[PDB]
């Protein structure tokens, strides 16, 4: 009646008090303690929560398997299914092939996404034990990885496909797959399939769930309670409940009802039950497309095209067709298609049944349909196309707001038979209004007309008038969206001409020029082809000496098995409490009142912490200008005001909603331009200048000025910020488990806030699911709050941020505005450069000044400039404080450099590769800050990359492509980089290690570095194993702790292997020195005997080690002293193809040559080049944050913030590590690698810029603007043509 019964990894679970609000993810993690399955977003975008469901399909009489997002799956929908998690398929004692292959192929860095990807791949193999390469890629459309750049995951998994320097891994050593050895379908569920299913009722704290067994039950419940909210896949309702704080006290799930799941062929088309998952629609229509003649399947193919780039497998397996229709989002991709095809909907209640052909009337208002409150949608008939009936579907792949302002379209034409004269014409659009619309003013005009140029121009003129948007229209991108509607129609117009041509008419139609053909092609991925080149170690190097060898990340197997422990995977103490932050909804305001009266009514509520609860100091942050908790004034949307403490996260979340703040607004400073004209800055102008600007400009042949805007970036570490604080009840003692790159500042900020000495506070980091600089300082806003809750209650307290919280609160990369003026000769030789930089720092200083320093240190990028002036000013604004992000001001400084350089080349009429080459530093040159460039490997990186990329021959093919294609264009660009290695604050260039050798010969090592997926622990073990001359297997690193190594620098500035490697090395030398006498006396006898002899001789088997980078210290005052220990160098050539009509593009090929000295670990270093490059690809081409005019972040999750996906990476992706370039002054001649490759993705940006120019010359001013990121909006709008001109002005 009442019991919930399902299986998890083959074990029966009986839940007697199922709460309808409980997700499967919460149940697995908090009820069953299976923490392999992760929380990444709670929104269905990221796949970190992916698990497999197995059930008996009654309607097909078979056992089916499908993946779902556990974060959105109500347990109440899972009666009598079997769940399989990552723990179900294998472990480190016996890894599944999927697990083994992702680990051994270097497909797991931080490891947080690994379980989810493993389960997506696993599920594919249960459905198709021999998939194509294409099926394998498609399996991950719902899986995001922030670290790997995807290449190693696809390459490792490519071994499962039927259609498949040393090597980074060996596929021959992989255990083969035996599909027979997968776990049995629970026989109990096969026995129960025979029992008839009856109605179930679950009653939660707030919500009642009725699982209906028949159409009669459902319609009865809706007739007596029209308020009953239907839930099917929960992919929309789940979001409304979790993120829009909507509550539906009565839910009915009709997913079991056969009539809602049926597929019926009829004379007019195929009828699908409303609750049919989109994956079933997809599989049914695909069989129909393959079997039926083309003339019948035009609408089917439009549906399939919309479903191609539509969430992943996890969403489509449970997302219902009916759910999509009734949600009635303005940006549904299906509703425009159903509307344009006039699909027939059947609506029923108790005692009524009606039919409506979908038209403009079906959607009368925002998120409304014409259903009555007691009706449900039974079914939708997707029609066969008739003879002379054509359909195209189109969509903007670039989303900015939750549910508006993304163009998506269905388009249909019916011709009078035998003719090219229009009988019917339907053009329907999402993203152009608060509902799906039809262009009903434009289409009637076209009836009778022939399908020709006069129709094209009439429809375009019509759409430009009818689809008007106010310049402040919701969702922005007004010109782009308008342009897309015409551009989509043009594609349809041309596509119809093609189809017409194929039909052998009496009246001849109009032929496409070959240069227009590529305009109608549907997206097609060619076969991936990846190359990784590195250097073999010397032949005489011991097999036990792993330095320079591609040893897998030490945790890779455990990460793939879901056994690796991240903060929130740590079990709860029974007395443990949960914290939830309460943040400002205003950019700048006084707090006038706080009312907690509603918070207090929430079960399990404990307290609301505010400034007045802070024992000692409310002043925190790097430069002591931040509140722990807001006092009288809030200074950004996201400013932490206080913290709810309750028994559970859900109770904390409800209580936080019941904290009402009243505000009195104050003048806000939001943008860089706001800050400039209010003189609102963090300290004074920073400046570097050399030579004589006046003389430089006055002697140049040409001068070019301009401006550039570069948007910021969210880290999107797949593990959000998380802290557990455990008060020990003695002497103010507290222990914190933190996802942080900075144990020292965590400890120090907690101690100061509480007013206790540092020696009472321990911060422990096992690993992070990613960091990328966003946990270098901003993690402490969570730590501090949670430390306070722990102190006040005397109980352990935990807080893991949800994605929307984390993105809003913790800031990101700094946006930059630059104004430049460059003076150059006709040869392209730069003689003068002046750059004013402005950064948007937000509402605390944090690292903003150091970041501006690093931009200024790299404003030269690779180029010697005799006369040069750079200034930087950091803007103070009412925004979340921006912080460190991999590159730390470098990529911003360097993009500006490459931007005016691109204009230098164009202005001169000279090849860009030549202009860059002749301006490049040479060995021994001084930089603008007077540091000498020794071991200047950049020229070799360049020469190698030119040859290996075949750049000159590929330039010719690009030019050829461009002459042959009017509406697609290609671009090709090769970009170098210099990146300075060391913290800009000299004393931070220090590190420590501590080593123990126990009496069994095993070694326990620790150092100040934190693991966040970069393989630092792996490297340090490799180092320790060489230093001590024992195998890696005898050495273990458990974690990083302030009570084993104190006063550590943050894990940052790419320098952690350098600093800690030396520390580790020194501690090992100390141990060796002490073992030397025992070695001498038994030079053969083994390690273990030396150690036991040392012990029983009372010799210390414990040592510290320490290192400081020598001889650093720059003065801005005298422009002297070396800020860097050395420089990293690299070069990337990238090629793109843009679609001039949509602003979409493909990354066709990227070739990278990177100097990492003699790599400690080429697998890991190649991993880092690829990951860094792909994060840069994101910065420069996708990844736009949007803010309201009043400074509220609107982009708070993967629905609206698009980080690179599996499908985003360069189709051919080649990486080489430079041979024979030892770097004497770092550990074992290695170089740092983490940050330097990031900027090389600018090569995709400038290739796009080259493509845009070619498009502009096709129709038909030379230095056009391309801001960063170069999104579809910016690319399309810059591709000026008849459509952009019409939309901007008749
Ligand atoms: C990560 C992600 C990506 C997505 N991407 C896209 C995309 O690219 N394009 C796109 O168009 N959509 C997209 N969606 C939306 C998705 O297609 C819809 O959420 C889904 O189809 C809703 O189906 P459901 O069964 O999950 O509905 P639920 O969330 O269970 O219900 C949705 C609504 O429909 C009502 N309802 C459901 N069935 C019936 C019925 N038979 N009769 C009457 N009312 C009913 C419910 O009461 C509810 O109001 C995305 C969703 C997610 C989570
Ligand atoms: S946590 Fe479920 S999709 Fe991201
Ligand atoms: S390894 Fe994939 S998110 Fe870090």
From Swiss-Prot:
The UniProt record describes its induction as: By interferon.
Consult the record and explain the modifications the protein receives after translation. Subject to partial proteolysis; this alters the enzyme from the dehydrogenase form (D) to the oxidase form (O). Contains sulfhydryl groups that are easily oxidized (in vitro); this alters the enzyme from the dehydrogenase form (D) to the oxidase form (O).
Q: Which SMART domains match?
A: Ald_Xan_dh_C (SM01008), CO_deh_flav_C (SM01092)
Q: What is this protein called?
A: Xanthine dehydrogenase/oxidase
Q: Which residues form the active site?
A: 1235
Catalytic activity as recorded in UniProt: xanthine + NAD(+) + H2O = urate + NADH + H(+); hypoxanthine + NAD(+) + H2O = xanthine + NADH + H(+); xanthine + O2 + H2O = urate + H2O2
Q: List the disulfide bonds.
A: 509-966
User: Which organism does this record belong to?
Assistant: Rattus norvegicus
């Amino acid at each position: 009646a009442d019991e919930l019964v399902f299986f998890v990894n083959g074990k029966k679970v009986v839940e007697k008090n199922a709460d309808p609000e409980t997700t499967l993810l919460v149940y697995l993690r908090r009820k069953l303690g299976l923490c392999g399955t992760k929380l990444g977003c709670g929104e269905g975008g990221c796949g970190a929560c992916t698990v497999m469901i197995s059930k008996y399909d009654r309607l097909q009489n078979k056992i089916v398997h499908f993946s779902v997002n556990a974060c959105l799956a109500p347990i109440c929908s899972l009666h009598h299914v079997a769940v399989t998690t990552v723990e179900g398929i294998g472990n480190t004692q016996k890894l599944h092939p999927v697990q083994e292959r992702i680990a051994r192929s270097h497909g797991s860095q931080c490891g947080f996404c690994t379980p989810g990807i493993v389960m997506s791949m696993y599920t594919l193999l249960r459905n198709q034990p021999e998939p194509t390469v294409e099926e394998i890629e498609n399996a991950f459309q719902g899986n995001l990885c922030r670290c790997t750049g995807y290449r190693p995951i696809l390459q490792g998994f490519r071994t499962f496909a039927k259609d498949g320097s040393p090597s980074l891994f060996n596929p021959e050593d992989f255990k083969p797959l035996d599909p027979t050895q997968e776990p049995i379908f629970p026989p109990e569920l096969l026995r129960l399939k025979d029992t008839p299913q009856k109605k179930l009722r679950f009653e939660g704290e707030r919500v009642t769930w009725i699982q209906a067994s028949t159409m009669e039950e459902l319609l009865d419940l809706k007739a007596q309670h029209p308020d009953a909210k239907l839930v099917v896949g929960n992919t929309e309702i789940g979001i409304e409940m979790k993120f829009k704080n909507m509550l539906f006290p009565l839910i009915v799930c009709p997913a079991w009802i056969p009539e809602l799941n049926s597929v019926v062929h009829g004379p007019e088309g195929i009828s699908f039950g409303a609750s049919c998952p989109l994956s079933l629609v997809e599989s049914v229509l695909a069989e129909e497309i393959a079997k039926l003649p083309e003339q019948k399947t035009e609408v089917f193919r439009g549906v399939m095209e919309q479903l191609r780039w539509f969430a992943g497998k996890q969403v489509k397996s449970v997302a219902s067709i009916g759910g999509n229709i009734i949600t009635a989002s303005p940006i549904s991709d299906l509703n425009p298609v159903f509307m344009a095809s006039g699909a027939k909907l059947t609506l029923v209640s108790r005692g009524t049944r009606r039919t409506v052909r979908m038209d403009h009337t079906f959607f009368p208002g925002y998120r409304k349909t014409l259903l009555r409150p007691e009706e449900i949608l039974l079914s939708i008939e997707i029609p066969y196309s008739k003879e002379g009936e054509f359909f195209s579907a189109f969509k903007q792949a670039s989303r900015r707001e939750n549910d508006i302002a993304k163009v998506t379209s269905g388009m249909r034409v019916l011709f009078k038979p035998g003719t090219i004269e229009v009988q019917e014409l339907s053009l329907c659009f999402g993203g152009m209004a608060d509902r799906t619309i039809s262009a009903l003013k434009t289409t009637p005009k076209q009836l009778s007309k022939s399908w020709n140029e006069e129709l094209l121009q009439s429809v375009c003129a019509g759409l430009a008038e009818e689809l008007q948007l106010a310049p402040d229209a919701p969702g922005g991108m007004v010109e782009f969206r308008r342009t897309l509607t015409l551009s989509f129609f043009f594609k349809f117009y041309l596509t119809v001409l093609q189809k017409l041509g194929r039909a052998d008419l009496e009246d001849m139609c109009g032929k496409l020029d070959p240069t227009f053909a590529s305009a109608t092609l549907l997206f097609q991925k060619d076969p991936p082809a990846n190359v990784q080149l590195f250097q073999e170690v010397p032949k005489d190097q011991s097999e036990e000496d792993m330095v320079g060898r591609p040893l897998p990340h030490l945790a890779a197997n455990m990460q793939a098995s879901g056994e690796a422990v991240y903060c929130d995977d740590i079990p709860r103490y029974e007395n443990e409490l949960s914290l939830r932050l309460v943040t400002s909804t205003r950019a700048h305001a006084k707090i006038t009142s706080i009312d907690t009266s509603e918070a207090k009514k929430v079960p399990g509520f404990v307290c609301f912490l505010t400034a007045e609860d802070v024992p000692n100091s409310n002043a925190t942050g790097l430069f002591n200008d931040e509140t722990v908790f807001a006092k009288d004034e809030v200074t950004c949307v996201g400013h932490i005001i206080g913290a709810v403490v309750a028994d559970t996260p859900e109770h904390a979340q409800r209580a936080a909603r019941g904290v009402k703040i009243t505000y009195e607004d104050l003048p806000a400073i939001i943008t860089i331009q706001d800050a400039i004209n209010n003189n609102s800055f963090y300290g004074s102008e920073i400046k570097i200048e050399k030579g004589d600007l006046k003389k430089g400009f006055s002697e140049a042949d040409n001068v070019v000025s301009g401006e550039l805007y570069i948007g910021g970036q969210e880290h999107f570490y797949l593990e959000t910020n998380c802290t557990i604080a455990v008060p020990k009840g003695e002497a103010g003692e507290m222990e914190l488990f933190v996802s942080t790159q900075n144990t020292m500042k965590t400890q120090s900020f907690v101690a100061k806030m509480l007013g206790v000495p540092d020696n009472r506070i321990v911060v422990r980091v096992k690993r992070m699911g990613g960091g990328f600089g966003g946990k270098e300082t901003r993690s402490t806003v969570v730590s501090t709050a949670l430390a306070l809750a722990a102190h006040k209650t005397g109980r352990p307290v935990r807080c893991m941020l949800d994605r929307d919280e984390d993105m809003l609160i913790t800031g990101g990369r700094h946006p930059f505005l630059a104004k430049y003026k460059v003076g150059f000769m006709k040869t392209g030789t730069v003689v003068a450069l002046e750059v004013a930089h402005f950064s948007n720092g937000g509402n605390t200083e944090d690292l903003s000044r150091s970041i501006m320093e690093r931009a200024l240190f790299h404003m030269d990028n690779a180029y010697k400039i005799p006369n040069i002036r750079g200034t930087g000013r950091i803007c103070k604004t009412n925004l979340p404080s921006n912080t460190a992000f991999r590159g730390f001001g470098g990529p911003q400084g360097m993009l500006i450099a490459e931007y005016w350089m691109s204009e230098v080349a164009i202005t001169c009429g000279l090849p860009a590769e030549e202009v860059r080459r002749k301006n490049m530093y040479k060995e021994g040159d001084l930089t603008h800050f007077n540091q000498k460039l020794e071991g200047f490997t950049l020229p070799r990186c360049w020469d190698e990359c030119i040859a290996s990329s075949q750049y000159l021959a590929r330039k010719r093919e690009v030019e050829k492509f461009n002459r042959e294609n009017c509406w697609k264009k290609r671009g090709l660009c090769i970009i170098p980089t210099k990146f300075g290695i060391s913290f800009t604050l000299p004393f931070l260039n220090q590190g420590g290690a501590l080593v123990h050798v126990y009496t069994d010969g095993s070694v326990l090592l620790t150092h100040g570095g934190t693991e966040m997926g970069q393989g630092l622990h792996t490297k340090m073990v490799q180092v320790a194993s060489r230093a001590l001359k024992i195998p890696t297997s005898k050495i273990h690193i458990s974690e990083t702790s302030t009570n084993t190594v104190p006063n550590t620098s943050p894990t940052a500035a790419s320098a952690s292997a350098d600093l800690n490697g030396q520390g580790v090395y020194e501690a090992c030398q100390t141990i060796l020195k002490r073992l030397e006498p025992f070695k001498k006396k038994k030079p053969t006898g083994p390690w273990e005997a030396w150690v036991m002899d040392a012990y029983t001789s009372a010799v210390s088997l414990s040592a510290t080690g320490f290192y400081k980078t020598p001889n650093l210290g720059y003065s801005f005052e005298t422009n002297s002293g070396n800020p860097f220990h050395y420089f990293s160098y690299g070069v990337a050539c990238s090629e793109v193809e843009i679609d001039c009509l949509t602003g979409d593009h493909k990354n066709l090929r990227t070739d990278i040559v990177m100097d990492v000295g003699s790599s400690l670990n080429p697998a890991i270093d190649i991993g880092q080049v690829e990951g860094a490059f792909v994060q840069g690809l994101g910065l420069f081409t996708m990844e736009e944050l949007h803010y309201s005019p009043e400074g509220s972040l609107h982009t708070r999750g993967p629905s609206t913030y698009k980080i690179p996906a599996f499908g985003s990476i360069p189709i051919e992706f080649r990486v080489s590590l430079l041979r024979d370039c030892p770097n004497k002054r770092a550990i074992y001649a290695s170089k740092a690698v983490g940050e330097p490759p990031l900027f090389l993705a600018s090569s995709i940006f400038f290739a796009i810029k080259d493509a845009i120019r070619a498009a502009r010359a096709q129709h038909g001013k030379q230095l056009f603007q391309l801001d960063s990121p170069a999104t579809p909006e910016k690319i399309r709008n810059a591709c000026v043509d008849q459509f952009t001109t019409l939309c901007v002005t008749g």
